[PDB]
């Protein structure tokens, strides 16, 4: 019942290694169920999902099954969900959380995040478009969205609340909000050796906000969300060399890198072998020279731009950080 | 319930912040009984002692007391004891552990360490001396001592075993020992901003050995163990400046420093105020720049030379590291 975790700025604890559940559309949802169960069996205690992934029914079932058969206790599973952009309006935040909880059949989520800062029109469609294919953007004061999130925490529906894909300006906007009750516990953003977020990371550290890295292994590289011409992280010569030296894998080196720099890292895999392999990140350590070697791979390569949401002022990736 | 721990190379888990129990000779033993109780209440889950500290009876009482009134469970207390140098002989190791356990009235210790690599003559006196006032050293093959330690772990008397005050050469001696069954899980050594052990730390990381830092706050400065004219760590301008900005203390900066470089840190305090303060190490973080600033304080200042044990082949502090 023991594993590595970090204390959040709201007193709760977050397991430093999380399991990602997002998969491509061409992948059946039944795969999420089997994958999450194998992840729990392997030793993952942190599970990351979201309403927009359209898999919470399956992920929730995996969790309930592992709890129901004695494999794990609810307090030993840290589950994260995310508020999708079609529910940024204050009065729609709690209903969105409650909808996810119903799909999951869980009483609460350990963490609820604002998934993306750009808002879209209310409704069932996650990406609402008009008759001419234009995304239907909505104007919403995120500070108001946050107050609705804070209320979800006070209601016990979400143990901790945080954000995702927020930049320096957006975080400051929340942190400088008059009457702020709860700082976000984290900022889940893309982070790997080719885009190490050094600057944003230091900022988060200075405010005791945990940076949670997604696409830590180089992302799924699926179109039209990621450009195929982008470099392949796991094929990097330095990572391959270090892997050989430590008798590990490029993926493990990339994951250990994050843990040693203070980042909570996610890792998605639907392959039984690789799922069990990623938990090996707690079996070795990198020296200072090796960590510096990895820092040197940084090359401003952002795999997930989500530019279909570019235009509105809240688009997060235009600023330096 | 939950707290920050690191996975050891034998599968067990060690809390990253430990409470030191060594106190000056001119300090009643009852002070340890009270201190440990407060440390446990403050949130310490890792307690560090040793046979040579002559306080295990009290430390044990404090622990069993907190377990008695339900303040904590045995499994949520990581207790460390150390084999003193008068019991390095193979046939004396288990008896020494059993003696510590009897004083503690505990069934097992979570960690048992070889306290210091230089051996002295068997007997009740911990620092036996001859007529001319010289220490009565003994000669013992540390590999034999280690094999005895391994048997203590297999017997269940110690969950994990490690070493303390070992240098590079001595660690390799154990790591390269024929028939090795268990690597040491840690090497507890002096470590702080004025002597950051970067080289030894990296070596340990390369072998997945956790470095545990003692005198992480500049030591007790008690003579004749420590030179009174030595620099005062907690009065360092950089640490003081960083402490001012973060609204903390120089001690907290020095402790946080260790946690972020992958070091498990000990903190001794018999003062209820400073005890509760040290636990605050989990409330903030240091940026890359602040860490670099602390790395710059390194100045080869070793407080505990234990030069009285100099001479034998195993004296550890003569080598570069
Ligand atoms: N909040 C956000 O905006 C956001 C955005 C993107 C992702 N995320 C979260 O982050 C999670 C992970 O990110 P991601 O989906 O971009 O992918 P990722 O973790 O970077 O991994 C990408 C690929 O790595 C492979 N892989 C996993 N372990 C491996 C190993 N040991 N060796 C070699 N390849 C390995 C996987 O393939 P196999 O499955 O075939 O093993 C997977 O397709 C997601 O599932 C989601 O929960 C959040
Ligand atoms: N294995 C070995 O060879 C070895 C050697 C030495 C020590 N150790 C272990 O390491 C533990 C700690 O090391 P240490 O005794 O050298 O001392 P330390 O932890 O470096 O601290 C030295 C002094 O710091 C003071 N202090 C504690 N917290 C403070 C705070 N927040 N602000 C200001 N001052 C503070 C304490 O005074 P107050 O008590 O008055 O608060 C104490 O006398 C020992 O008790 C022992 O368990 C192991
Ligand atoms: C890529 C990411 C996960 C996959 C989704 C995407 C938003 C649009 C989408 C709509 C869907 O119906 C399926 C999933 C997805 C393609 C998300 C933006 C942030 C990240 O979590
Ligand atoms: C300084 C240190 C802790 C205090 C002890 C010392 C060895 C001699 C001693 C004998 C005693 O009866 C009291 C404690 C102490 C003074 C230890 C050597 C390594 C370190 O743990």
DSSP string spanning A199-224? Answer: HHHHHHHHTT-EEEEESTT-----TT
* Cα dist from B239 to A97, B192, B235, whole Å: 44, 12, 7
Task: Retrieve residue B204's tokens.
Answer: 């340990």
Q: Do B198 and A282 touch (CB under 8 A)?
A: no
Q: How far is the CA of B126 from the centre of ligand 4 (A)?
A: 9
CA gap B208, B185 in Å, rounded: 8
With residue A80 as reference, give the H or E element that holds it: strand A78-83
**Helix B237-246 / helix B288-295 crossing angle, nearest 10 deg:** 160
In contact, B242 and B291? CB cutoff 8 Å: no
Cis geometry, peptide bond prior to residue A224 (ω within 30 degrees of 0): yes
Counting one residue from chain A and one from chain B, the pairs whose CB atoms sit within 8 A come to 57
- Cβ within 8 Å of residue B45, ≥6 positions away: B3, B5, B15, B72, B76, B77, B78
Task: Retrieve residue A181's tokens.
Answer: 């009750």
B217 lines ligand 2 (CB under 6 A): yes
Rg (CA), chain A: 19
The secondary structure of A274-297, three-state, reads HHHHHHHHHCCCCCHHHHHHHHCC
Q: How many CB atoms lie within 10 A of CB B123?
A: 11
Task: Retrieve residue B196's tokens.
Answer: 């950051």
**Which has the closest alpha carbon to B201: A31, A260, A193, A58?**
A260
Residues of B in contact with A5 (CB under 8 A): 2-5
Taking CA A146 as the corner, what is the angle to CA A140 and CA A148, rounded to the nearest 5 degrees? 95
State residue B270 phi and psi, 5-degree precision: -105, 10
Q: Do A285 and B208 touch (CB under 8 A)?
A: yes
Q: Ligand 2, from B19, B21, B22, B111: best to mutate by most atoms within 8 Å of Cβ? A: B22
Q: Is A156 helix (H, G, I), strand (E, B) or coil?
A: coil
In contact, A44 and B41? CB cutoff 8 Å: no
Task: Retrieve residue B20's tokens.
Answer: 């030191």
Question: Which residues is chain B interrupted after (C–N above 2.5 Å)?
Answer: none
Residue with tokens 């005050």: B165
CA gap B286, A177 in Å, rounded: 24
Q: What is the dihedral of CA A278, A281, A287, A289, to 10 degrees?
A: 20
CA gap A55, B210 in Å, rounded: 39
State residue A28 phi and psi, 5-degree precision: -55, 150
Q: Is A316 helix (H, G, I), strand (E, B) or coil?
A: coil
In contact, B202 and B177? CB cutoff 8 Å: no
State how far Cα A305 lies from the chain centre: 15
What is the CB < 6 Å shell around ligand 3? A 22, 50, 52-54, 126-127, 225, 304, 306
Task: Retrieve residue B145's tokens.
Answer: 């001592």
Active-site residue, B108 included: no
Q: Give long-range contacts, CB 8 A cutoff, 24+ apart: A59-63.
A: A59/A21, A59/A32, A59/A33, A59/A104, A60/A103, A60/A104, A60/A105, A60/A106, A61/A33, A61/A105, A62/A32, A62/A33, A62/A34, A62/A35, A62/A36, A62/A37, A63/A36, A63/A104, A63/A106
Q: Could you tell me the residue ranges of all domains in chain B?
A: 1-321
- Cβ within 8 Å of residue B59, ≥6 positions away: B21, B32, B33, B36, B47, B49, B104
Q: Do B13 and A7 touch (CB under 8 A)?
A: no
- Cβ within 8 Å of residue B12, ≥6 positions away: B110, B159, B160, B185
CA gap B17, B248 in Å, rounded: 17
The ligand whose atoms approach the alpha carbon of A84 most closely is 3
The ligand whose atoms approach the alpha carbon of B221 most closely is 2
Q: Do A208 and B283 touch (CB under 8 A)?
A: yes
Q: How far is the CA of B274 from the centre of ligand 2 (A)?
A: 11
Q: CA end-to-end span of chain A, whole Å? A: 38
Task: Retrieve residue B299's tokens.
Answer: 């100045």
Q: Do A7 and B283 touch (CB under 8 A)?
A: yes
* Cα dist from B257 to A149, A153, B115, B131, B195, whole Å: 33, 32, 25, 46, 12
Q: Is the dihedral of CA A266, A267, A268, A270 positive or negative?
A: negative
Q: How far is the CA of A270 from the centre of ligand 1 (A)?
A: 9
In contact, A110 and A47? CB cutoff 8 Å: no
The secondary structure of chain B, three-state, reads CCCCEEECCCCCEEECEEEECCCCCCCCCHHHHHHHHHHHHHCCCEEECCHHHCCHHHHHHHHHHHHHCCCCCHHHCEEEEEECHHHCCHHHHHHHHHHHHHHHCCCCEEEEEECCCCCECCCCCCCCECCCCCECECCCCHHHHHHHHHHHHHCCCEEEEEEECCCHHHHHHHHCCCCCCCCCCEEEEECECCECCHHHHHHHHHCCCEEEEECCCCCCCCCCCCCCCCCCHHHCHHHHHHHHHHCCCHHHHHHHHHHHCCCEEEEECCCHHHHHHHHHHHCCCCCHHHHHHHHCCCCCCCCCCCHHHCCCCCCCCCCCC
CA gap B218, B208 in Å, rounded: 26
Q: Is A177 helix (H, G, I), strand (E, B) or coil?
A: coil
Q: Ligand 2, from B15, B17, B18, B20: best to mutate by most atoms within 8 Å of Cβ? A: B20
Identify the active-site residue in B3, B53, B112, B270: B53
Taking CA B123 as the corner, what is the angle to CA B126 and CA B224, rounded to the nearest 5 degrees? 15
With residue A158 as reference, give the H or E element that holds it: strand A158-164
User: Resolution of the coordinates in A?
Assistant: 1.8
**Which has the closest alpha carbon to A148: A181, A126, A119?**
A181
CA gap A72, A7 in Å, rounded: 21
In contact, A233 and A304? CB cutoff 8 Å: no
| Site from A46, A110, A206, A286 to mutate, B interface, most B CB atoms within 10 angstroms | A206
With residue A82 as reference, give the H or E element that holds it: strand A78-83
In contact, A78 and A50? CB cutoff 8 Å: no
CA gap B195, B45 in Å, rounded: 26
Q: Is A195 helix (H, G, I), strand (E, B) or coil?
A: strand
Q: Taking the CA of residue B67 as centre, how many other CA atoms within 13 Å lie in the half-sphere pointing to its CB?
A: 15
- Cβ within 8 Å of residue B288, ≥6 positions away: A198, A201, A202
CA gap A118, A80 in Å, rounded: 20
Length of chain A: 321
Q: Is A7 helix (H, G, I), strand (E, B) or coil?
A: strand
In contact, A314 and A138? CB cutoff 8 Å: no
Taking CA B295 as the corner, what is the angle to CA B289 and CA B299, rounded to the nearest 5 degrees? 150
User: How was this structure obtained?
Assistant: X-ray
**Which has the closest alpha carbon to A193: A168, A219, A167?**
A219
Task: Retrieve residue B117's tokens.
Answer: 């690599």
In contact, B287 and A202? CB cutoff 8 Å: yes
- Distance of residue A153 Cα from the nearest chain B Cα, in angstroms: 20
| Domain B1-321 CATH (choose: 3.40.50.300, 3.40.50.720, 3.30.70.890, 3.20.20.100) | 3.20.20.100
In contact, B129 and B98? CB cutoff 8 Å: no
Q: How many CB atoms lie within 10 A of CB A142?
A: 20
Residues of A in contact with B199 (CB under 8 A): none
Helices (H) and strands (E) in chain A, counts: 10, 10
Q: What is the dihedral of CA B237, B241, B243, B249, to 10 degrees?
A: 30
State how far Cα B140 lies from the chain centre: 22
Q: Do B2 and A4 touch (CB under 8 A)?
A: no
DSSP structural state of residue A132: T
Q: How many CB atoms lie within 10 A of CB B23?
A: 19
In contact, A275 and A42? CB cutoff 8 Å: yes
Residues of A in contact with B4 (CB under 8 A): 4-7, 13
Q: Ligand 1, from A15, A186, A217, A265: best to mutate by most atoms within 8 Å of Cβ? A: A217
Q: How far is the CA of B217 from the centre of ligand 4 (A)?
A: 17
DSSP structural state of residue A266: E
Beta B264-268 vs A17-20: how paired, if at all?
Answer: unpaired
Q: Do A287 and B202 touch (CB under 8 A)?
A: yes
Beta bridge partners of A113: A82, A162
B81 lines ligand 2 (CB under 6 A): no
In contact, A83 and A149? CB cutoff 8 Å: yes
Residue B16: closest C-alpha in chain A: A4
Q: Ligand 4, from B20, B21, B22, B54: best to mutate by most atoms within 8 Å of Cβ? A: B22
In contact, A154 and A122? CB cutoff 8 Å: no
Q: Taking the CA of residue B204 as centre, how many other CA atoms within 13 Å lie in the half-sphere pointing to its CB?
A: 29
Residue B202: closest C-alpha in chain A: A287
CA gap A90, B126 in Å, rounded: 69
CA gap A23, A47 in Å, rounded: 14
CA gap B181, B150 in Å, rounded: 7
The ligand whose atoms approach the alpha carbon of B214 most closely is 2
Q: Is A188 helix (H, G, I), strand (E, B) or coil?
A: strand
CA gap A189, A195 in Å, rounded: 10
Taking CA A290 as the corner, what is the angle to CA A285 and CA A295, rounded to the nearest 5 degrees? 115
With residue A60 as reference, give the H or E element that holds it: helix A56-68
- Cβ within 8 Å of residue A118, ≥6 positions away: A85, A137, A309, A312, A314, A315, A316
Ramachandran category for residue B314: left, alpha or beta (phi over 0 → left; psi -120 to 50 → alpha): alpha
DSSP structural state of residue A189: E
Q: Is A48 helix (H, G, I), strand (E, B) or coil?
A: strand
| Site from B2, B206, B282, B294 to mutate, A interface, most A CB atoms within 10 angstroms | B2
CA gap A75, A73 in Å, rounded: 5
Rg (CA), chain B: 19
B215 lines ligand 2 (CB under 6 A): yes
Characterize A286-303 residue by residue with b for buried, 16 or more Cβ atoms within 10 angstroms of its Cβ, and e for exposed. bbbebbebbeebeeebbb
Q: How far is the CA of B52 from the centre of ligand 4 (A)?
A: 6
CA gap A4, A13 in Å, rounded: 10
Q: Do B285 and A13 touch (CB under 8 A)?
A: no
Cis geometry, peptide bond prior to residue B224 (ω within 30 degrees of 0): yes
Q: Do B7 and A283 touch (CB under 8 A)?
A: yes
CA gap B233, B298 in Å, rounded: 11
Q: How far is the CA of B143 from the centre of ligand 4 (A)?
A: 24
Task: Give the one of B13, B208, B284 whose C-beta lies nearest to A2's C-beta.
Answer: B13
In contact, B3 and B43? CB cutoff 8 Å: yes
Task: Retrieve residue B182's tokens.
Answer: 């268990």
Q: Is the dihedral of CA B196, B200, B205, B211 positive or negative?
A: negative
Q: How many CB atoms lie within 10 A of CB B131?
A: 5
In contact, B314 and B142? CB cutoff 8 Å: yes
Residues of B in contact with A201 (CB under 8 A): 288
A221 lines ligand 1 (CB under 6 A): no
Q: Is A161 helix (H, G, I), strand (E, B) or coil?
A: strand
């Amino acid at each position: 019942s023991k594993y590595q975790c970090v204390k959040l700025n709201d007193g709760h604890f977050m397991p430093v290694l999380g399991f990602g559940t997002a998969a491509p559309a061409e992948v059946p949802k039944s795969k999420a169920l089997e994958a999450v169960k194998l992840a729990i069996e392997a030793g993952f205690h942190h599970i990351d999902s979201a309403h927009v992934y359209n898999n919470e029914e399956q992920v929730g079932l995996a969790i309930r099954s592992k709890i129901a058969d004695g494999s794990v206790k609810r307090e030993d599973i840290f589950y994260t969900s995310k508020l999708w952009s079609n529910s940024h309006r204050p009065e729609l935040v709690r209903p969105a959380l409650e909808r996810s909880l119903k799909n999951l059949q869980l009483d609460y989520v350990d963490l609820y995040l604002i998934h993306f800062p750009v808002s879209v029109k209310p409704g069932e469609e996650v990406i609402p478009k008009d008759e001419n294919g234009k995304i239907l953007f909505d104007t919403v004061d995120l500070c108001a969205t946050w107050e609705a999130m804070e209320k979800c925490k006070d209601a016990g529906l979400a143990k901790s609340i945080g954000v995702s894909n927020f930049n320096h300006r957006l975080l400051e906007m929340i942190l400088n909000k008059p009457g702020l009750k709860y700082k976000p516990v984290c900022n889940q953003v893309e982070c790997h050796p080719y885009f190490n977020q050094r600057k944003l990371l230091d900022f988060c550290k200075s405010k005791d906000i945990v940076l949670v890295a997604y696409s830590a292994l180089g992302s799924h590289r699926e179109e039209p969300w990621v450009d195929p011409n982008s470099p392949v992280l796991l094929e990097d010569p330095v990572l391959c060399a270090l892997a050989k030296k430590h008798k590990r894998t490029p993926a493990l080196i990339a994951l250990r890198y994050q843990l040693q720099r203070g980042v909570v890292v996610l890792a998605k895999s639907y392959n039984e072998q690789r799922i069990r392999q990623n938990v090996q990140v707690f079996e070795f350590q990198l020296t200072s020279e090796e960590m510096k070697a990895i820092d040197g791979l940084n090359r401003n390569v952002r795999y997930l731009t989500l530019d279909i949401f570019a235009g509105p002022p809240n688009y997060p990736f235009s600023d330096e950080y």
